[PDB]
Amino acid sequence: QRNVFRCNVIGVKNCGKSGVLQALLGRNLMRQKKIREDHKSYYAINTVYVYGQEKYLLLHDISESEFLTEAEIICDVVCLVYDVSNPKSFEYCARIFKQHFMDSRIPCLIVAAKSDLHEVKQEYSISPTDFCRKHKMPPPQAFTCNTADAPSKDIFVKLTTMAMYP
Numbered sequence: 001q002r003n004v005f006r007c008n009v010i011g012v013k014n015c016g017k018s019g020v021l022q023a024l025l026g027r028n029l030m031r032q033k034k035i036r037e038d039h040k041s042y043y044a045i046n047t048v049y050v051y052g053q054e055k056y057l058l059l060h061d062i063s064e065s066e067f068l069t070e071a072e073i074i075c076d077v078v079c080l081v082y083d084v085s086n087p088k089s090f091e092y093c094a095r096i097f098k099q100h101f102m103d104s105r106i107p108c109l110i111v112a113a114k115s116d117l118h119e120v121k122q123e124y125s126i127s128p129t130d131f132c133r134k135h136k137m138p139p140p141q142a143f144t145c146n147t148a149d150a151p152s153k154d155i156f157v158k159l160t161t162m163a164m165y166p
């Protein structure tokens with residue numbers, strides 16, 4: 001029936017959440033810097049085709065906080081973003097997941113953002129891939145909006161599909 005799926009994008013400050021939203025709007029990192037708006041938008045929506053069917057993904061950029069409200073938790077799919085160049089970024093995703101999403105039926109996708117940069121060891125007891133396995137998530141999906149042309153919309157197809165068939 002419904003073809004608009006809500007996705008909460010979660011991660012530490014400057015882990016690249018805003019970049020993910022802008023990428024859904026077809027803007028790479030270069031154009032994101034050229035753009036100047038009166039106010040930054042923490043929501044973004046765009047068309048996402050799944051199996052030839054027109055769907056829409058509504059992204060909600062959740063700014064970093066030690067605590068999330070039920071308003072920031074309810075969604076069709078959660079996108080946990082960490083920065084491959086920030087060794088402290090994944091711990092936040094893992095903590096938020098266990099605290100708010102582990103005991104729910106909301107599908108979760110982990111995104112390794114800024115994949116264009118050089119990977120560093122994450123300061124967490126578990127590796128990102130092991131964490132996904134333990135909690136029955138897909139593998140961490142590499143992502144970058146730092147491209148010559150429009151960023152790849154692969155993660156958005158994935159997020160939308162996961163939301164469709166929870």
Ligand SMILES: Nc1nc2c(ncn2[C@@H]2O[C@H](COP(=O)(O)OP(=O)(O)O)[C@@H](O)[C@H]2O)c(=O)[nH]1
Nearest residue numbers: 012013014015016017018019114116144145146
């Ligand atoms: N190299 C690189 N830098 C990025 C990427 N995405 C964001 N950044 C930079 O990382 C910083 C934080 O990004 P932003 O999207 O504002 O993070 P947010 O605070 O989580 O929304 C900015 O200086 C961005 O230009 C990416 O894919 N690659």
